[PDB]
């Protein structure tokens, strides 16, 4: 992505894609996953069937937890009866009873952990729509495992590209015009700004896809003159240094993807690459500027 946009004030991407800067920058920094597209009508047709499957699975976890609770409660009751038969002191009775009660509390709480996870999964499944965010990778891993069928989501600069190219401008422009036709100044000003940006896009005759680059150019060599000192040292404009960094990192990416490796290293390295291009198009725009000497 082009540093001049996701960092600019106003951030053209934020207004066009109606995302807060925090959410946008997160994707740029390979921080959290994002949901791209969802066949909501396709989920709707079986929403009842999905809920029924939920009922049976949640009842299954209910049955296993109830069985565990019954087993442990019977065990504790038998232990207490045995201790009474042995005529031990009430101190031992309370020790065993507290141990068993805490065990059952832990069991019930773990059952509740599973149940609340299940309802979180559901909530996020039903009230699911584009531009939503999932901070924690584990929950997304779970979602794609249980229900990897409807919503396709991935985090990268390319996530945004697919979202925008799939996105349409005229419909949003009409909706914003309709909102403006109404009142409610508070939201009306935001509608005005977004409509201005979208109308500029539409009139330009271009497409937003220009905000995601795939081929940066390089200026001629003379513009970045190369200088030889008494010892032939390279002390010319650092433009050569920045291009060196970008090219080197791209070649590392290519070699690594050729060799094959898990997702973490790809992304970690990609985040690094994103930072280099942002630095080259501008140093010090955001974050610590690079400093060699």
């Amino acid at each position: 992505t082009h540093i001049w946009y996701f960092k600019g004030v106003p951030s053209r991407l934020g207004y066009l894609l109606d995302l807060a800067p925090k959410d946008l920058e997160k994707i740029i920094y390979f921080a959290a996953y994002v949901i791209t597209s969802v066949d909501e009508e396709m989920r709707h047709n079986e929403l009842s069937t999905l809920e029924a499957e939920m009922a049976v699975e949640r009842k299954a976890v209910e049955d296993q937890r109830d069985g565990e609770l019954e087993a442990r409660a019977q065990k504790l009751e038998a232990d207490l009866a045995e201790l009474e038969a042995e005529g031990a002191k009430a101190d031992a009775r309370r020790k065993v009873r507290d141990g068993g009660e805490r065990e059952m509390r832990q069991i019930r709480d773990r059952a509740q952990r599973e149940l609340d996870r299940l309802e979180d999964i559901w909530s996020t499944f039903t009230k699911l729509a584009p531009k939503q965010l999932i901070v924690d990778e584990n929950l997304y891993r779970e979602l794609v495992d249980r229900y990897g069928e409807y919503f396709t989501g991935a985090m990268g600069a390319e996530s945004i590209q697919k979202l925008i190219e799939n996105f349409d401008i005229d419909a949003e422009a009409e909706s914003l015009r309709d909102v403006i036709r109404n009142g409610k100044g508070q939201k009306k000003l935001r509608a005005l700004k977004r409509l201005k940006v979208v109308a500029a896009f539409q009139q330009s005759g271009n497409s937003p896809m220009g905000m995601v680059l795939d081929a940066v150019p390089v200026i001629p060599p003379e513009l970045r003159p190369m200088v030889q000192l008494d010892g032939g040292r390279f002390a010319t404009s650092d433009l050569n240094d920045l291009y060196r960094r970008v090219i080197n990192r791209n070649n590392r990416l290519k070699r690594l993807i050729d060799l094959g490796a898990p997702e973490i290293i790809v992304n970690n390295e990609k985040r690094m690459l994103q930072e280099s291009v942002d630095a080259l198009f501008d140093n010090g725009r955001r974050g610590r500027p690079v400093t060699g000497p």
């Binding site: 082009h2 220009g210 680059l213 940066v216 150019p217 198009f281």
Partner: peptide
């Protein structure tokens, strides 16, 4: 800087 600067001689 990716800014297509045309001339529009017309």
């Amino acid at each position: 800087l990716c800014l297509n600067v045309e001339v529009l001689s017309s």
